[PDB]
Amino acid sequence: EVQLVESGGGLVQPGRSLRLSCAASGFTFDDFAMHWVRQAPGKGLEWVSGISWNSGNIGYADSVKGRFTISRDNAKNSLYLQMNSLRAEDTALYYCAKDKSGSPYYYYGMDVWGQGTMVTVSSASTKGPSVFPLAPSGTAALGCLVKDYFPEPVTVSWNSGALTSGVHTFPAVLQSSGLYSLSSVVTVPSSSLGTQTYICNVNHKPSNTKVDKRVEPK
Amino acid sequence: EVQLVESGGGLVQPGRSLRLSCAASGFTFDDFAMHWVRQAPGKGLEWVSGISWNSGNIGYADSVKGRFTISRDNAKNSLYLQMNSLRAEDTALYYCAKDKSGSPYYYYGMDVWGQGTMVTVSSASTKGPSVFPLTAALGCLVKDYFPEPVTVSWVHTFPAVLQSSGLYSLSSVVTVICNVNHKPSNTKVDKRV
Amino acid sequence: WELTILHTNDVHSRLEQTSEDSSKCVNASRCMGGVARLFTKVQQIRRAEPNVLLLDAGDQYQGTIWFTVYKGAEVAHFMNALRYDAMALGNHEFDNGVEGLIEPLLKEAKFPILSANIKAKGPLASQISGLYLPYKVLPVGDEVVGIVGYTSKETPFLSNPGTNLVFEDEITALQPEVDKLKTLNVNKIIALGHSGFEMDKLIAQKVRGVDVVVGGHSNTFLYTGNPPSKEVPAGKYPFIVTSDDGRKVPVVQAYAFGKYLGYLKIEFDERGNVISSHGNPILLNSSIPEDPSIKADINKWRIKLDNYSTQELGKTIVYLDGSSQSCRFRECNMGNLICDAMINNNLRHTDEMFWNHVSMCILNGGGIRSPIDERNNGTITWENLAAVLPFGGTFDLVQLKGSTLKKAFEHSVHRYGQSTGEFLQVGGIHVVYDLSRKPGDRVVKLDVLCTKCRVPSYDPLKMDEVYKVILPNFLANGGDGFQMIKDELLRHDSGDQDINVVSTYISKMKVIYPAVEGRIKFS
Amino acid sequence: WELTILHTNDVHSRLEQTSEDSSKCVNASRCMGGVARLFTKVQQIRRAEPNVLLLDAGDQYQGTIWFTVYKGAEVAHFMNALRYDAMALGNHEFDNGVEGLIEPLLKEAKFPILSANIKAKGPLASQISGLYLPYKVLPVGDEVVGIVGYTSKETPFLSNPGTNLVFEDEITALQPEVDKLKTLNVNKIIALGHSGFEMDKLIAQKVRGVDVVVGGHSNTFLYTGNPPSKEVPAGKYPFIVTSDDGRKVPVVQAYAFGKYLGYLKIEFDERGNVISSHGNPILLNSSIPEDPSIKADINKWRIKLDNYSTQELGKTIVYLDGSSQSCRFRECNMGNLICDAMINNNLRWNHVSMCILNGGGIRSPIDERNNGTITWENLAAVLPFGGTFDLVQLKGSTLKKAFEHSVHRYGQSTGEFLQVGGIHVVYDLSRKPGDRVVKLDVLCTKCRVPSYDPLKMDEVYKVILPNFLANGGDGFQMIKDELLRHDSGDQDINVVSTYISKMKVIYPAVEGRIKFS
Amino acid sequence: DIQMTQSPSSVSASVGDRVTITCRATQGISRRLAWYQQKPGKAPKLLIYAASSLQSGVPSRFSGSGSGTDFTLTISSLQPEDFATYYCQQANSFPLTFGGGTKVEIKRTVAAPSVFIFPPSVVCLLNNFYPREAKVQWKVQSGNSQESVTEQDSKDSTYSLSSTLVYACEVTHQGLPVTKS
Amino acid sequence: DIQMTQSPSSVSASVGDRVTITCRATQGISRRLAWYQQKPGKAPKLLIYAASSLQSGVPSRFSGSGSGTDFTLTISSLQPEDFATYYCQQANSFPLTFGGGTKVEIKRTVAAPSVFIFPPSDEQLKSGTASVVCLLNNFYPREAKVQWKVDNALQSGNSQESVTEQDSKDSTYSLSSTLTLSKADYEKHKVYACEVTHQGLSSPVTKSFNR
Ligand SMILES: *[C@@H]1O[C@H](CO)[C@@H](O)[C@H](O)[C@H]1NC(C)=O
Ligand SMILES: *[C@@H]1O[C@H](CO)[C@@H](O)[C@H](O)[C@H]1NC(C)=O
Ligand SMILES: [Zn+2]
Ligand SMILES: [Zn+2]
Ligand SMILES: [Zn+2]
Ligand SMILES: [Zn+2]
Structure with a gap:
């Protein structure tokens, strides 16, 4: 029932801005603190930002402080993250997460996570591989x-799925x-090189x- | 429910004879005129024979008249087609079809067709490709x-x-x-x- | 162009051959009806005559063990075997509900099922659209005949169709269908429906363009000449109605229970008008042999009935005292149970609105033979009910005067003390006997349940008033004395089988607990 | 440390706002209760206070049409919406059996449902294992609070738990769980449960280690000062019990029907002992706005309700005659139909065949002129009090005196006139009150063939009453204080609707059960 | 015998359009005419059993019409399941002759034939062409050749042909003359 | 910010083996600690929200303990569904830092790598670049070392490494080391050797194509 859906992520040129959005359903959005959490490819979790139910208490990580701005619309049950002055270090999957605590005075971790939205801050253009x-040399x-x-x-x-082993x-x-x-x-198998096409x-x-x-063997 | 099973079709030499049989299962056999239809490989349909419920009215196509003989056994709910003096033009899939009309005085097409039996007439012997x-x-x-x-x-x-x-x-x-x-x-x- | 319309109406699940009064077959040399016999007759007519159109006017549902075990599957199967050309929905087709109509019959039947004046609304309109048609255009011979179906508007009160079905007026819904048929260049139109003989005559008179009317719902017997059996005709076959357009419209009906095969021959010109029409229903008596294949199929299907005979219909908390020392001397709870079964069966699903308020039941004490023991885990089976009611009769609806009813009750205690079986178990009747008085005056109190009253209460009998009461067919046809009943009937209708009714009531009453409530007392 | 216990008990599926008397809300400007209003108040309290613990003492199942249609799904849904911290099983949680509790509530609740004295057996032991716990350690703020719950031993008699559930003594089942919590470094323990105010006080005095007791099952109103509504307090809030260990244990209840929200502030020390406690039940009147989101959800779910209410339950051939001039003066169709519904529901105490019912319970007639249609709305109009039909064991003298009281003041159009079933009573209004019951026959039980035999004063009988009759309503005081056994049964409207749906066409008649000389 | 002619021999139609097939007997047969539909490798099924009389279980999409000598089958709003061979059959009197048949085919864009040669019996192979009306010559030769054409493909809805006899195969088709050896 | 340390970085465990993960805070965070489990490609799942409170639906085999500065997560009777990454997170005050993470991976017997070398394709040589690939197939444990010896000269840079997760069946690892050079640079040397050192090998394995 409790569901969080991210949107707005995509390819960003370095130095530019991008606004992530998170639609919430299945719970009272104005009762829980909401968090934005990074995960860069191959690395662990990084807490980006957090906002209270009434936006009275707002926190940022020291790496995003002064650039990112977290906000929320309780009428539209939405969470927003305006990322400014982006750089290659912010390339990550961003989750909007709902705090477990129903109390504004405490944090009990995050119990509901979204699917995440990928933000790729890179100046490289979309290029085809x-x-x-x-070639091969039991x-x-x-x-x-x-x-x-x-x-x-x-x-x-x-081989269009014919090779799934190995x-x-x-x-x-x-x-x-x-x-x-x-x-x-x-x-x-080495004997399959002369007959089987790979x-x-x-x-x-x-x-x-x-x-x-x-x-081929080449 | 309604079903018609054909048997007796197979390889046969020209000038020989066959006897196709058709067993009826899920309908009153002695109420419907029963037809033998013929479809050459890659060709169209060709009605070759038909018999009435009491076998009083028997009809053959002009190409099979004088050679074929349709008959029926109502007690066994079966239809028979004796095929004498066969030729290479008689090889085809034979369908045992049941007439739609329940009235002996009318024909309303054919609503039930059994899976055909392949009758092949050839003097060639079976051999590998x-x-x-x-x-x-x-x-x-x-x-x-x-x-x-x-x-x-x-x-x-x-x-x-x-x-x-x-x-x-x-x-x-x-x-x-x-x-x-x-x-x-x-x-x-x-x-x- | 000559058309031979064969039709049956109100078969009421009489698959096997029955007696002369729809009761269970006893003497095979004197039994009538049956699906197998009708098959032989229809086969003969089809082989001998070109344009033959077999139709059903409805009420193939309900009446025997076949409908309880198979729930209409047997009806669809054997009407497919008989190859009906069309069928009109009846009031009893909505027994067991629209769910019990769609799956067993509407899906399995190969013939069209017609009802023009039934409209589906709500979620049902998606699941039932196309399963029943307002009309059907059937090619008969080289010509084409349109058939428009209809059902009585009283179906909601005579059955349980539900809320999602609206039964519009027969004429106002049939007129657009007939106009559309004549638009389609169909000049031969048959009104096959289940709204009663009077409504059939009204449709013939009012609806323009209808040539023949094949009806049901009334068990009306029409015959021209000396009748072949006990049925007294209410008119000539066909009944000619002078339409408002000046045409003459035949109206036909073939009684009920598959005893007769309505047989009509009509002459049509090039314009589709009727020049002449003549015929008579065919009595399917023992002279017509039963078809061996259909009889074998019936015997094959009887295996499930025999298995169901040992199945547990329900449970009883109390001992069902059906002993002769109790049900032929005093009020016994088995008699009360059987009367409640009759009344509840009649009120749940009624053949006609004439009988939809019947709350009075009488049942001779000789009709109860064996008791049912509750020590067997309280289970009641079909075999025990067969032991209770072995004669295989029916529960008929009969209209009497107050004098006839009081004389029947006087006869019930005319020879008390001799263990005779004329002692009537009652339902919806409070009778008090004074055995000291002479016979003919022993019934000192006789109160009956008022029906015209808004709230039913036990009011004293009136000798000039007219009362509707459910009886065994044994009593209606005389029986253990009771000649005054048979002599002074005002109206008679045959009903469902006895053990069928009792078993269905016990199935609905999953636990039964009849008691000696004081319906019969002695001063 | 400071803890704010918000608690509710005996709500009885009162999801919408009700009147002052907890009936249907007519004037929306003067209506109390509701889960939207409760959500608003709980939201305010949780935003204002750091350590809040919203607890439920049970009996959240049953009471209105919401439970008739959704059968506990609405209860679990809206307690998940209100974010309850814990619940204790009430007796009414077993009304639909143990299967009707496992599926709608136990498997759908997002909060621990607790009872330390319910023990499962045999096949049910594996199916219900882990669905309800004996206790739960809930972290509140920086502390941990151990909540151990309990249920009445009378649940087998007040409900339908089954043969695979044992409801043992609350004290001897709570003490091991409280000790287990003590060895788990939990020093603040709340005894949440559904056993009545008296058993709550007994738990407070006897169980060692319990700090606060939150209870239900008694509809007990505790208030300090002048109460804000018509409820009369049974004691101060909280009720302070001096336990055998020397500690003062607060015991709190919040009346019933969601009209009040119990609010108790407890200040603990470092060792978990209650230094003191104070509070009151907050009255949820129109001064507290209903939460728009919860109200919209109630409106969405209240469509299925109005769709089910209108649908046809069965056909009636006759006029049911629920008019006050008939049900309070003579035998009526409706009383006979209701008695038959009770008897059939019980039989389908397996041989009970007697029924009495006050004529004041029949309020509206049902018209057969409307195509003979019976709906849930008509039956609800007939019996709008939302009671249940209960089995009781009476003596012949007690039933005889009850029937005298039934006609002790005949002619005043009061509701004490009794409709009967399986009873033939003949009155004589000419003689003085207390002897006007000339004849009284009842259906014999434990007999092969039932029959109506004269009532024996020294014998013992089993009768299906309403709650009003079994609790001294419309008079009948000799019934309430003389029942040998008293077991609650199914709902009134539910039983009547089940009987009507079973009998697709009903035709009740004045059968002469009640007669006058 | 009542010889019956069916027109056209082949009709190419797209899904959603209306297909009209005409059948004419050598003598009046009243409305004793039936329409059958047959799929490849399956027994024929009855669609119409009397003129303008739909068979049970058959969609109202198919419509029969006509009388006397001329009859017509109309498939309005064609669907992928209606691409089969339709036959008219006179049910007037014995013999109950059938018609020549009318194939309903999926209409797709014109595709040129991909021509390949295979020396030994030389084989000329045409791949993925449309419409079916191609022509193949050998120019070695007249006669002594057999042409096998596959049915319309399930996915590509095209046709493939194989003709078996410098020996240069020449192919002419409306999607083009390609000569290869 | 309250810096958070997690030990060990990775732990080898089989089914039924008790697993202990220690989280240490920079300052006292009372008992405000959360433990999360993350599968590859899936969002993190909250296992423990207080220092010891189990999330609903989490098996009882997961246990939390500790307080103040030191906290512990224990998995008794480890199951195949528990081979994931585990994170601790302090919930004291903003910022809400996460821990480094601890990968719990399936323990198995040692497996020597299969070393293959792939010289640059002529296509990319025509495209102006050279990529030499060195593949270590089905080795365990993950600790493997790869060096590039071109003309018997070791290259510290110009190399990148990719490692798959554990195999679904074999639970082993595979490594791909890519050496990237300009086409002109690759035209000078000839040896282009890949040397592999792994604990499952008695001696390092050197593969070369000498072209
Ligand atoms: C059967 O009924 C017919 C009339 O339909 C009658 O002629 C014939 O004699 C009857 N036979 C018997 C045996 O009742
Ligand atoms: C509601 O209850 C409160 C608290 O007792 C009281 O002050 C107020 O007057 C009540 N009624 C309304 C309509 O606000
Ligand atoms: Zn009828
Ligand atoms: Zn009828
Ligand atoms: Zn309660
Ligand atoms: Zn309670």
């Missing part, structure tokens, strides 16, 4: 390198140029790019 | 196989075509190993191309 083959490893794309989400499959798709790494790099590998399919929805690379 | 290899496209040619049913796997599977020798031919193509299964001859050929 370049897919390269990692079993041989063979893969595809999904290099120099943006933003982060890409989907890598093998599929190791590594998390993307943000390169020094602001573009993401990725690689997916499969370990397969194909890496890369899907980048943000750039609407579908690439199909046939990896 | 011969498999040959064939943007780029590849495929396999399945020639000189008999009878008609065959399966090809690896995709466009064309309909079979009768040769001048009575043996079916087939072709399957794909866009870039052909596996051919012929149950009547118990043949299974996996040919790479």
Whole structure:
């Protein structure tokens, strides 16, 4: 019943501003303190901001203080986070969270979390991935390198789902140029290299790019 | 509920005879005129025979008149078609169809059709398929196989075509190993191309 | 163009052959009706005559063990086997509700089911639209005949259709349907419905364009000549109605319980007008053999009835004293239970509005044979009820005068002390006997439940007043004496089977507890 | 430390605002109670005070049409909306059986539902395990408060808990749980429960370690000073009990029907001992606005209510004659129908066949001229008092005296005239009061074939009364103080509607159960 | 015998449009005409059993009309489940002759045939063309060839053909002449 | 801000093994501590909201304890559904800092990595860049070290590493080390070796393509 829905997140140029919104349902919004919580890719939770039921007590993390502004509309059951003077350090999934305490005087942690909205503060333009083959030399490893794309989400499959065993798709790494790099590998029997065709399919929805690379022994 | 089961169809030589039987289950058999219909492979429907409830009125198509004989046993709820002096033009799927009208004096089409029985008339003997290899496209040619049913796997599977020798031919193509299964001859050929 | 309309109405689940008065078959050489016999007759008529149209006017639901065990599945199955061409909804089709109508009958039937003056509203309109049609256009031979259905507006009071169904006026709803049919170039129109003989005549007179009217709901017998059985005709078959347009419209009906097969022959010209119409209902007596296949199917379906005979209908808290030493000498709670069963069955679902307020019941003490023991975990089964009521009769509705009722009650104690079975168990009647007085004056008090009164209360009998009372068919046809009843009936209607009624009442009353309430007393 | 206990008890599904007498709200400008108004007050208190603990003492199930339609779903929904901190099982929580408690409330509540003296058995033990707890340690502020709950031992007789539940003594079941809380470093313990004010005082005196007692089941009003409404206090608020250990334990109740919100401030020391306590029940009149969101939710849920109320329960052939001129002077159709409903509901005490009912309980007739339609609204008009029909054990002399009182003042159009079922009573108004019952026959029980036999004064009988008759209403004082056994039953309107829906067509008649010479 | 002609031999229609099929007998048969619908690899089903009489369980979408010598089947607001072969059958008197049939096909855009050669019996393969009316020649040869055309594809709704006999295959089709060896 | 420390950073545990996580605050926070459990790709779930109060629906095997500066989370009889990341959070006053987190991962026997090397594809060489990949397949524990020895010269920079989560079945890890160079830079050297040191190996494993 208790539900929080984030919105407004997206791609931000460095130094620009963006307003996150959070719609609340299933509970009295004006009875609970509401929090904004970060999670950057691969790192743990970071408390961003917090607001009381009547906006009388507002707190910010020392890393967002003076830039972010938390606010709330109890009439529309909405929470707002105006992020200003953004930088690459704010690239994270932001959760709006509802405090467990129904008392304005105490905090009992956060018991209801939203799905999160991703904010990607980067000057790199949306670019389609370049897919390269990692050719194999008992079993041989063979893969595809999904290099120099943006933003982060890409989907890598093998033989349209026919290969699901041995599929190791590594998390993307943000390169020094602001573009993401990725690689997916499969370990397969060496006798299957000469007859079985291995194909890496890369899907980048943000750039609407579908690439199909046939990896061979070479 | 209503159901019609056909039996007796199969391979037969030209000039021989067959006897198709049709069992009726879920309706009053002795109340409806009962028809034998014929559909050649890839062709349309062809009403070949019909019998009344008391067998008083019997009708045959002009192409089967003098050769075929329709009959019925109401006590056994069964319909029979004796087929004498068969020819290569009589190979088809035979449907045992029940007339819609409950009035012996009228015909209202045919509302219930049983699954057809395949009657194949040919002098060719059953033998295994011969498999040959064939943007780029590849495929396999399945020639000189008999009878008609065959399966090809690896995709466009064309309909079979009768040769001048009575043996079916087939072709399957794909866009870039052909596996051919012929149950009547118990043949299974996996040919790479 | 000559059309042969075959029709049945108010079958009332009489699947097996019954006696001459819809009671259970005893002498096979003298039994009538039945689905198998009707199948043979309809098959003969279809084989011998070209344009044959078999129709049902309704009330195939309710009446026997078949409807309690199968809940209308048997009706749909055997009317599909008989290959009915159309059927009109009746009041009894809404027994067990719209839920009990849609699933067993409306879904399984292959023939159209017609009712023009029934409108669905609310959530039901989505689930029932298309299952019943205002009319049906059936091709018969080389011609085309339209059939418009209707049901009595009294269905909400005679059954339990629910709130989501509105029963509009028959004429005001039939007129647009007939006009639409004549728009579709259908010049042969049949009004097949279940609103009663009087409303059939009204439809024939008022609705323009209706050629024949096939009706029901009244069990009206029409015959032209010497009747073949005990039914006394109320008119000629067909009953010719002079329509307001100057045409002559036949109105036909075939009594009830599948005893007769209404048989009509009509001559139509090119314009669809009726030139001549003649016929007579066919008595389906023992001369017509039962169809062996349908009889075998009935025997196959009887297996579930036999299994259900040992099923527990309900429970009883108290001992059902049906012994002869109690039910033939004094008031016994079994007799009270049976009278309550009759009255409740009649009031829950009534054949006609004439009988919808009946609260009086009499039942001869010889009709109760064995008691029911509550020591068997209190369970009551169909076998125990068969032991109580083994004759397989029916519970009929009968209209008498006050004098006839008082004379029946005097006869009930005319020979008291001899263990005779004429002692009447009563319901909705308070009778007090003074055995010291001479016979013919022993009934010193006789109060009956008023029906015209707003609040029912026990008022003294009036000898010139007219009272409606539910009897066994044994009593209505005479029985243990009681010739004064049979002689002085004013109106008679056959009803549901005895054990059927009692079992249904016990099923509704999951726990029964009848008592000796003082309905019969002695001064 | 300072704790603010907000508590409610015996609400009885009073979700909407009611009148001053807790009936249907006619004048909305002078109406009390409601869950929206209670939400407003609780919201104010929680915003104003740091340590608040909203507790429920039970009997939240049953009382109005809300429970008839939603059967406890509305109760759980609106206590989750009001964010109760804990609840104790009342007897009425078992009215729909243990299955009717597990599904709507136990599995849907977002707060601990507690009872330390209910023990499950056999098949029910695994199904109900963990759904209700003996106690709960709730963190309030920086402290922890241990709330241990209890239920009446009379629940098997006042309700339908089943054969798999045992309701043992409250003292001997609370003491082990209080000790267990003590070993868990919890020194502030609240005994929340549903057993009546007397058992609350007994728990306060006997159980060692209980600091505050919050109870229900008694509709007891405690007030300090001049009460704000028509309720007469039974004692000061809180009622101070000197326990055997030497401590002063406050005991608090908040009347019933959601009219009041008990508000008690307790100041503790570091060791958990109550230094002192003070407060009052806040009267929730129109001066407290209803919360617009909770009011909108009530309006949304109150549509299904009005949809169910209008629907047809059955058909009636006859005029039911609920007129005061008939039910208070002679035998009426409606009294016979009501007695039949009671008897059939009981039988379907398994052989009870007797029924008496005051004619003042029949208020409105039902018209068959409206297409013979009976609705829930008509039956609610007939019996708008929201009572239950209870089984009692009486003597022949007691029933005889009750029937004398039924006609001891005939002619004044009072409601003490008795409609009967399974009883044949013949009066004679000519003779003096106290002997006007000339004949009195009852249905024999424990017999193979029932029959109406003369009432034996020395014998003992089982009769289905209303609560009004069993509690000395409309007179009948000799009934209330002479019952050998008294077990509450099902609702009045619910029983009558069940009987009418079972009998699709009803046709009650004046059968001559009551006669005059 | 009452020979019956059905027009057109093939109709290409899109989902939602109206399809009209005409059937004409050699003599008046009153309204003794039936319309059947048959799917590939399935027994025919009765749609209309007398002129303008819908079969039970059949949508009111199909409508029969006509009398005497001319009859008509109309499928208004076509749906994907109505792409089949429809036959008219006269039920006047024995013999109960059927019609030639009328195939209802999905209408899609014109697609050029993808031509491929296969040397040995040379095979000429046409892929994903539309409409079905293509023409293939060998120019080796007249006769001694067989053409197999698949039914309309479930997804692409196209047609594929295979013709079996320099031996250069020449293909002419309205979506284009492609010659390849 | 009340800085918050959590120990250990990661703990190895099997099913049925008791797990202890310690959270230490900078200053006394009384008993205002929350413990959260986060699965990969899912929002955090509150397990403990006071220092010891269990959230509704949380199994009783999770226990909280401690007060003031030191707090403890204990999982007795660990289950497969408890292999997640656990966070502590002080709820004293704004800012409401979180702890570092503690990953509880499935313990299993040691597994030597399978070392593969992938030279740069000719496609990216034509595109002006060279990417040399070194894949360690199905090793345990996570503690593996990778070095790049090009012409027997170690490269500290120009390398990045990606590590998958534990395998669904094998519960092992995989590592991908990418060495990125300019096309001209890659045209000079020849060796381009990847050296792997892991506790499951008696000696380091060196893979090269020498091109
Ligand atoms: C049966 O009834 C017919 C009239 O329908 C009559 O002629 C015939 O004699 C009857 N037969 C018997 C055996 O009752
Ligand atoms: C409501 O109760 C309060 C508290 O006793 C009282 O002051 C007030 O007058 C009452 N009524 C109204 C209408 O405000
Ligand atoms: Zn009727
Ligand atoms: Zn009737
Ligand atoms: Zn209460
Ligand atoms: Zn209570």
